[PDB]
């Protein structure tokens, strides 16, 4: 059972000719476009299973495939005999060397009259070498292939059985331990409207029963298990129990994640592996409980938000979601802020109403000291805006690297700064430069702490105390103590922010009780996200953005004290 | 002599009150705004010298100050008693902790009626702590200060002698070796119209005589020495010989560089230290020997180019220049390509005529394997231009990190690629996207090799064979075999490129002998630089850009064979 299994992954390009093979290969199945993940070719002339996971030619985002070939121990790279190798395979293959197994080349479309076998074999070598190995040698691989089912190999018997061999000879079964505690890391992931969350992966240690307690790793939660199932033909069928080394799937746990892990409960722990897919930012997703409880849009009862969040986790790799104590709340994490602000803005137009907390970083503990994540920052501002921007960032732990003046009168700057400290300067490096704040930046890596808090705002806010439209009567008078997000006539409610206060402390005012008034500010989504403190939320609807305190009345604000 | 010296550096901000102190401090000098680098306060009630190097409040580019405080062992930070600490000192000071000595706080303007001594001392602590230390403690420092020459310290005798002490107590003399072979690394740098190149730095080992042979390090050259001089008052005066630990200056060697080194010739070698100021790119600067030998501009005879190159090396820190075998040629290196293309474009408008070779990288040998430099690349292109840009970079060793789609229909991409391989895609990622090729990128660090050559072009070129204007007679006929940088009527010469050829091989054609002609391409400076091969040069004048082969006639091209 253990030495039988052969875990591999297919790769093909615009020459749509994958299976094709598998389809015809099915010379076993139930003897008596398109999918999937995966397909068994359990065959003989031993009854060896052969799990075959499709590696997508379409590059998803944040690198899906890293996870795919972490399962398998070898690969199948199909190529056209007339065309030759192609650029869409370069992304996959270049990632199948460093990690990393024996490959198997498959020269298809030989049955074509327009075809070039000797030339393609030679064309492979030169583009295949540039990717090191550094073996091959064999690299065998170097088969014929005919979907339609001569010269070179063989030729030519049952253009099928010969291949079988190719896999079983050169691809080995995974070095994994049958016995001991159960252990598995979840490589792939998917979802269904009723069924819930789904697993998929190889099996590192032990075995699994349908009803069998387990524990989640990276954090602590240890929810139960219910139903389990494996793979046969183009289908996923149920199973009572199975051992090891099997690309078999699973349901009824948690939320669960890509690069997550879950083993037994005794004599185990833990599971590492990042590899470079870990998230860096956390924020909450809780349902809108404010005075527009399902007014402006359509989707509200936390049931469906979960679905909407889950369904993204199928083809969004760089994303993690987590369950909470209070069930109308979910912590959603990702590769960045604009990786999370995309999710939010997409849901607005679909017609959602909900609220999200402020982005705190993921200080992922890397070896002794509690490391946090940093970004390589690029600025292009005018020379008069340098002395300001140097000051504003030198206060957020702004270590400068290589400023480079560019003749013009315009100057370039290259900072590196902690993610935690880079929350807020997206508003200010625009407010300073006055439109000409050419700036966006990339993630670098995990570095030490600042340390201590650094990305905190000064100011308080001008808070309301009732429902109604803002008036000349109030707004022209309130706006002397700092600025405004709103203007003449706008339905507000108790617990909202209409604007900024000129000092650090906050205020509760009434807006209902020579104007001539100052327009308001354009606070967009991500600007609202970066803005809020550790006691404020961002109310988002399909129509406009409004910001609120977590507690509505002035006295409910005074309640928060421990 | 050795335990006497005290090497320190001043720091002050908009409160222009440096010296001020020094000026009045001169209580020795020759007893019987502005400068400089540096000033001695050789005094007593031992005759201890005190070299004082000004650290500029103006941030230069590529970090000048790293080098400044590499000389000194402590610092003097002057501050206003009324105002307090300021943002321009944040850049300097934050770099005086990690490397790194005892500081000395100086509370000036106490004599002002508007002044706040107790408050400033307290204001220091909080902004001074955020920069770790992690001592202080003392941190003493904490003196009075009156230019005009009470409460707190002292007070108050000769508001001058007390200070002297402050330096001599807490600042130590440098741990350096009097004896053995001579050794020194050149921290600062400057130039004069006749005199030549100048040194400046501390003294690590040994001593120096005026006429005394020596050797340069990082490479091999071992040119002679002629004249040497030290510091007394606001002046640099000559000296017969001096030992160790002395911020003393020097002339008549080489070219010479910042972060360069030069020791004896026996029992020595070598000098390290980068620290992060090393260059990454090399290109040549040779005089224009082509058929516009001093036509369109004014400056040509290699004498003055050297001056122009040298004078930049005073306040351009991220730059290195080197001498050659053929004296009408100089290798100029820097922190990048656009750090070097700025120098070039500036010289054009001044009225220079010269030529430069193609940028090859600086594969600086970092530990065993010959490492080369890499860049964090950022792309913002439209979704239809992704599949192209992935192919074009996957061929230049384009390892993708974190692609991030942004809802719109526009997509973001974050590559990392070897500098060597990123030469050329600045033309192509514009030629693909068709104006919308939002791209510039930052240096990352030194990584392994590709390896092997990767940033080489395919095509040959359409080369001329005589002087005259391009005609309908030729150009409409030549342009069938690839494209053109020029059009109807343009004075050319033998050995120039007018355009591209459709295959990899080159061609020699005549342009003098239904048109209707295709306009030409706009080949700018940096586009011309990235374009040329390892046997082509870029001719730059104050008027327009033209590109040529290194050898003029077709037969002179056939000459290059070994
Ligand atoms: N001559 C030849 N062609 C091959 C071979 N393998 C695949 N093809 C071609 O590929 C197309 C389908 O792509 P495949 O890659 O085979 O589909 P698959 O993902 O399900 O394997 C077919 O085009 P189609 O017929 O237009 O599509 P359909 O009508 O089959 O749907 C078929 O002609 C081969 O060995 N020889
Ligand atoms: N009250 C007071 N002022 C101080 C003190 N130290 C410096 N200053 C002021 O600083 C200005 C000059 O800047 P400094 O920093 O002293 O010049 P420096 O670089 O040569 O030392 C002077 O202004 P100025 O007089 O307008 O310039 P000038 O007429 O002297 O050129 C002077 O009034 C101090 O201890 N007390």
PDB file of N, CA, C and O in Angstrom, chain B residues 254-280:
ATOM      1  N   UNK B 254      47.195  58.849  -7.679  1.00  0.00           N
ATOM      2  CA  UNK B 254      46.288  58.376  -8.732  1.00  0.00           C
ATOM      3  C   UNK B 254      46.111  59.375  -9.876  1.00  0.00           C
ATOM      4  O   UNK B 254      45.423  59.069 -10.871  1.00  0.00           O
ATOM      5  N   UNK B 255      42.441  57.097 -10.581  1.00  0.00           N
ATOM      6  CA  UNK B 255      41.917  58.078  -9.629  1.00  0.00           C
ATOM      7  C   UNK B 255      41.679  57.473  -8.229  1.00  0.00           C
ATOM      8  O   UNK B 255      41.775  56.255  -8.038  1.00  0.00           O
ATOM      9  N   UNK B 256      41.412  58.347  -7.259  1.00  0.00           N
ATOM     10  CA  UNK B 256      41.165  57.969  -5.860  1.00  0.00           C
ATOM     11  C   UNK B 256      39.669  58.078  -5.501  1.00  0.00           C
ATOM     12  O   UNK B 256      38.937  58.806  -6.165  1.00  0.00           O
ATOM     13  N   UNK B 257      39.210  57.376  -4.459  1.00  0.00           N
ATOM     14  CA  UNK B 257      37.771  57.331  -4.140  1.00  0.00           C
ATOM     15  C   UNK B 257      37.365  57.403  -2.668  1.00  0.00           C
ATOM     16  O   UNK B 257      38.178  57.208  -1.765  1.00  0.00           O
ATOM     17  N   UNK B 258      36.080  57.693  -2.457  1.00  0.00           N
ATOM     18  CA  UNK B 258      35.421  57.534  -1.155  1.00  0.00           C
ATOM     19  C   UNK B 258      35.297  56.039  -0.915  1.00  0.00           C
ATOM     20  O   UNK B 258      34.994  55.293  -1.846  1.00  0.00           O
ATOM     21  N   UNK B 259      35.532  55.611   0.325  1.00  0.00           N
ATOM     22  CA  UNK B 259      35.566  54.183   0.697  1.00  0.00           C
ATOM     23  C   UNK B 259      36.709  53.393   0.018  1.00  0.00           C
ATOM     24  O   UNK B 259      36.673  52.154  -0.031  1.00  0.00           O
ATOM     25  N   UNK B 260      37.721  54.110  -0.479  1.00  0.00           N
ATOM     26  CA  UNK B 260      38.892  53.491  -1.079  1.00  0.00           C
ATOM     27  C   UNK B 260      39.905  53.358   0.050  1.00  0.00           C
ATOM     28  O   UNK B 260      39.674  53.833   1.172  1.00  0.00           O
ATOM     29  N   UNK B 261      41.029  52.713  -0.245  1.00  0.00           N
ATOM     30  CA  UNK B 261      42.081  52.516   0.745  1.00  0.00           C
ATOM     31  C   UNK B 261      43.456  52.476   0.087  1.00  0.00           C
ATOM     32  O   UNK B 261      43.586  52.105  -1.080  1.00  0.00           O
ATOM     33  N   UNK B 262      44.479  52.860   0.842  1.00  0.00           N
ATOM     34  CA  UNK B 262      45.847  52.870   0.334  1.00  0.00           C
ATOM     35  C   UNK B 262      46.857  52.742   1.469  1.00  0.00           C
ATOM     36  O   UNK B 262      47.003  53.650   2.287  1.00  0.00           O
ATOM     37  N   UNK B 263      47.553  51.611   1.511  1.00  0.00           N
ATOM     38  CA  UNK B 263      48.551  51.363   2.544  1.00  0.00           C
ATOM     39  C   UNK B 263      49.956  51.310   1.953  1.00  0.00           C
ATOM     40  O   UNK B 263      50.180  51.738   0.820  1.00  0.00           O
ATOM     41  N   UNK B 264      50.899  50.783   2.727  1.00  0.00           N
ATOM     42  CA  UNK B 264      52.282  50.673   2.281  1.00  0.00           C
ATOM     43  C   UNK B 264      52.404  49.738   1.083  1.00  0.00           C
ATOM     44  O   UNK B 264      51.462  49.586   0.305  1.00  0.00           O
ATOM     45  N   UNK B 265      53.569  49.114   0.941  1.00  0.00           N
ATOM     46  CA  UNK B 265      53.815  48.194  -0.162  1.00  0.00           C
ATOM     47  C   UNK B 265      54.332  46.852   0.344  1.00  0.00           C
ATOM     48  O   UNK B 265      54.392  45.876  -0.404  1.00  0.00           O
ATOM     49  N   UNK B 266      54.706  46.810   1.619  1.00  0.00           N
ATOM     50  CA  UNK B 266      55.219  45.588   2.227  1.00  0.00           C
ATOM     51  C   UNK B 266      54.523  45.299   3.552  1.00  0.00           C
ATOM     52  O   UNK B 266      54.246  46.210   4.332  1.00  0.00           O
ATOM     53  N   UNK B 267      54.242  44.023   3.802  1.00  0.00           N
ATOM     54  CA  UNK B 267      53.578  43.611   5.033  1.00  0.00           C
ATOM     55  C   UNK B 267      52.324  44.431   5.313  1.00  0.00           C
ATOM     56  O   UNK B 267      52.262  45.175   6.292  1.00  0.00           O
ATOM     57  N   UNK B 268      51.325  44.292   4.447  1.00  0.00           N
ATOM     58  CA  UNK B 268      50.071  45.019   4.599  1.00  0.00           C
ATOM     59  C   UNK B 268      48.931  44.311   3.874  1.00  0.00           C
ATOM     60  O   UNK B 268      48.983  43.102   3.647  1.00  0.00           O
ATOM     61  N   UNK B 269      47.903  45.072   3.514  1.00  0.00           N
ATOM     62  CA  UNK B 269      46.749  44.520   2.814  1.00  0.00           C
ATOM     63  C   UNK B 269      45.865  43.705   3.761  1.00  0.00           C
ATOM     64  O   UNK B 269      46.361  42.824   4.464  1.00  0.00           O
ATOM     65  N   UNK B 270      44.562  43.991   3.785  1.00  0.00           N
ATOM     66  CA  UNK B 270      43.952  45.032   2.959  1.00  0.00           C
ATOM     67  C   UNK B 270      42.991  45.890   3.775  1.00  0.00           C
ATOM     68  O   UNK B 270      43.070  45.931   5.002  1.00  0.00           O
ATOM     69  N   UNK B 271      42.084  46.574   3.084  1.00  0.00           N
ATOM     70  CA  UNK B 271      41.106  47.431   3.743  1.00  0.00           C
ATOM     71  C   UNK B 271      39.687  47.099   3.291  1.00  0.00           C
ATOM     72  O   UNK B 271      39.382  47.147   2.096  1.00  0.00           O
ATOM     73  N   UNK B 272      38.799  46.751   4.300  1.00  0.00           N
ATOM     74  CA  UNK B 272      37.444  46.438   3.833  1.00  0.00           C
ATOM     75  C   UNK B 272      36.499  47.625   4.005  1.00  0.00           C
ATOM     76  O   UNK B 272      36.878  48.757   3.706  1.00  0.00           O
ATOM     77  N   UNK B 273      35.285  47.364   4.480  1.00  0.00           N
ATOM     78  CA  UNK B 273      34.296  48.416   4.689  1.00  0.00           C
ATOM     79  C   UNK B 273      33.638  48.832   3.377  1.00  0.00           C
ATOM     80  O   UNK B 273      34.314  49.252   2.437  1.00  0.00           O
ATOM     81  N   UNK B 274      32.315  48.711   3.321  1.00  0.00           N
ATOM     82  CA  UNK B 274      31.553  49.077   2.117  1.00  0.00           C
ATOM     83  C   UNK B 274      30.971  50.509   2.239  1.00  0.00           C
ATOM     84  O   UNK B 274      31.303  51.350   1.405  1.00  0.00           O
ATOM     85  N   UNK B 275      30.118  50.825   3.222  1.00  0.00           N
ATOM     86  CA  UNK B 275      29.433  49.889   4.126  1.00  0.00           C
ATOM     87  C   UNK B 275      28.149  49.446   3.432  1.00  0.00           C
ATOM     88  O   UNK B 275      27.819  48.256   3.375  1.00  0.00           O
ATOM     89  N   UNK B 276      27.434  50.437   2.911  1.00  0.00           N
ATOM     90  CA  UNK B 276      26.402  50.231   1.901  1.00  0.00           C
ATOM     91  C   UNK B 276      26.491  51.342   0.836  1.00  0.00           C
ATOM     92  O   UNK B 276      25.478  51.750   0.266  1.00  0.00           O
ATOM     93  N   UNK B 277      27.713  51.811   0.560  1.00  0.00           N
ATOM     94  CA  UNK B 277      27.976  52.860  -0.438  1.00  0.00           C
ATOM     95  C   UNK B 277      28.625  52.355  -1.735  1.00  0.00           C
ATOM     96  O   UNK B 277      28.788  53.147  -2.668  1.00  0.00           O
ATOM     97  N   UNK B 278      29.000  51.067  -1.797  1.00  0.00           N
ATOM     98  CA  UNK B 278      29.643  50.477  -3.001  1.00  0.00           C
ATOM     99  C   UNK B 278      28.795  50.667  -4.265  1.00  0.00           C
ATOM    100  O   UNK B 278      27.568  50.663  -4.199  1.00  0.00           O
ATOM    101  N   UNK B 279      29.452  50.814  -5.422  1.00  0.00           N
ATOM    102  CA  UNK B 279      28.716  50.934  -6.669  1.00  0.00           C
ATOM    103  C   UNK B 279      28.275  49.578  -7.192  1.00  0.00           C
ATOM    104  O   UNK B 279      28.804  48.547  -6.764  1.00  0.00           O
ATOM    105  N   UNK B 280      27.335  49.598  -8.136  1.00  0.00           N
ATOM    106  CA  UNK B 280      26.846  48.380  -8.797  1.00  0.00           C
ATOM    107  C   UNK B 280      27.003  48.344 -10.326  1.00  0.00           C
ATOM    108  O   UNK B 280      26.834  47.279 -10.912  1.00  0.00           O
TER     109      UNK B 280
END
